[PDB]
């Protein structure tokens, strides 16, 4: 069955990750203790529940969970893409190579972001961060524990972006696409996620997930409407550019100004290595540099968007 498996793994790239996921889930669920006393629980579920409240700690089972759901997102990407989009993008009159590949990619992005954007907004709705309040982003800083949904959202985003990065590294496509700053952006994204989790800055990182996700959703929807040659694509592009300007630039300059102003004024600002209080004069430059790098990369894309608007308004 060596040749059959080779052919299936060539055609369907999701069969191996599906087998891994199926095996792990069957082994975990066809058993007795499904609680933290199982060895597969550190992969299937989030660990370090503080007592029996709704607040989870951090550890190495976080790495195990992130790795297992990297495998899960690798399965989901290929399976969903093929099995669903193939039929959808073929029963729709799109006849090309570049058009089919990019409609593939943007419809998958639409699905994932439609799932993860409202999820993040719901997580930010059930906290004091409601509506990008930047003070609740610093008041109770050390934040060693996160709620259930907040932690699973955070770590699912980490697993998804880690899988994107490893796909970017383990190439399976012509790399040359004329947009390289994407590698730097992916590096900055993983650094932000990981340092945000490790150094207890997760309440600070949630608004950025929300703002990047909603912009990604609108941009992917507009590019799909472009691909289908609909004529309704310009309205969607205008909605996208307004929402991009607001949600990325206004909100992220608000967050960068919040760093400079209320990093030093809200909560604890005296360094304590014993209490793991890292909010101090030392980490302020690090936080500002990382978010400023992200915002410069976003400003570049704003320049590109304005360039395209220019072309559209004289051509």
């Amino acid at each position: 069955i060596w040749f059959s498996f080779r052919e299936i793994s060539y055609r369907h790239a999701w069969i191996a990750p599906l087998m891994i996921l199926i095996a792990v889930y069957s082994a975990y669920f066809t058993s007795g203790n499904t609680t933290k006393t199982n060895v597969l629980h550190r992969f299937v579920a989030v660990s370090y529940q503080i007592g029996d409240t709704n607040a989870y700690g951090k550890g190495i089972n976080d790495l195990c969970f992130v790795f297992y759901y990297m495998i899960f997102f690798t399965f989901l990407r290929e399976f969903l893409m093929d099995v669903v989009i193939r039929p959808f993008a073929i029963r729709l009159h799109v006849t090309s190579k570049h058009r089919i590949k990019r409609i593939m990619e943007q419809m998958y992005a639409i699905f994932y972001t439609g799932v993860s954007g409202p999820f993040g907004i719901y997580c930010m709705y059930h906290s004091d961060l409601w509506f990008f309040n930047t003070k609740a982003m610093y008041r109770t800083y050390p934040d060693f524990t996160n709620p259930f949904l907040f932690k699973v959202f955070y770590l699912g985003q980490a697993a998804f972006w880690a899988q994107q990065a490893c796909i970017l590294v383990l190439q399976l496509e012509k790399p040359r696409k004329d947009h390289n700053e994407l590698t730097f952006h992916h590096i900055v994204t993983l650094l932000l996620i990981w340092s945000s989790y490790v150094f207890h800055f997760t309440k600070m990182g949630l608004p950025i997930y929300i703002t990047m996700d909603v912009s990604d959703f609108l941009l992917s929807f507009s590019k799909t409407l472009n691909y289908l040659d609909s004529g309704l694509a310009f309205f969607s592009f205008a909605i996208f550019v307004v929402a991009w300007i607001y949600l990325r630039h206004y909100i992220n300059l608000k967050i960068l100004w919040s760093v400079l102003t209320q990093f030093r004024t809200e909560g604890n600002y005296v360094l304590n290595f014993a209490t793991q209080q890292y909010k101090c004069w030392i980490s302020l430059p690090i936080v500002f540099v990382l978010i400023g790098a992200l915002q410069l990369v976003n400003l570049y894309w704003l320049f590109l968007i304005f360039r395209v608007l220019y072309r559209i308004l004289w051509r």
Partner: protein
């Protein structure tokens, strides 16, 4: 399919993760190195006076750790046997230092000497217990 590039980048990333976690753990268990600075004060002959001074993060635990580290690292009990006492300031909270450089009295002081002059340590620690080492 650059499998080796993926392996190398994952390897490096895991070393980054482990290095940062060790940084956190080591700075948490060895925090008095960053927050407390030892202040020695020679008295007469071989004996000195120990205390530590820092900001609010130099608590009584940090002062005690700094003092005992100085005692056990600046004196060699194999060459000659030493003697010391630890004196606590009980008119002081565990967390008592301010940010600015006007800090008052320490939470802990120690007098340390060699057994060649143990009478000086005995008369310099008034009625506090004296530990031999």
């Amino acid at each position: 399919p650059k499998i080796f590039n993926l392996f190398r980048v994952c390897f490096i990333s895991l070393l980054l993760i482990a290095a940062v976690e060790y940084f956190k753990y080591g700075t948490r268990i060895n925090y008095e190195w960053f927050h407390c600075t030892p202040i020695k004060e020679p008295q007469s002959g071989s004996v000195i006076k120990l205390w530590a001074r820092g900001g609010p993060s130099c608590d009584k635990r940090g002062e005690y750790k700094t003092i005992v580290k100085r005692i056990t690292r600046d004196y060699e009990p194999n060459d000659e046997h030493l003697s010391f006492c630890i004196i606590e300031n009980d008119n002081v909270p565990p967390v008592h230092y301010p940010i600015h450089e006007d800090k008052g009295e320490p939470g802990y002081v120690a007098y340390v000497g060699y057994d060649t002059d143990s009478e000086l340590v005995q008369e310099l620690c008034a009625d506090s217990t004296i530990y031999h080492m």
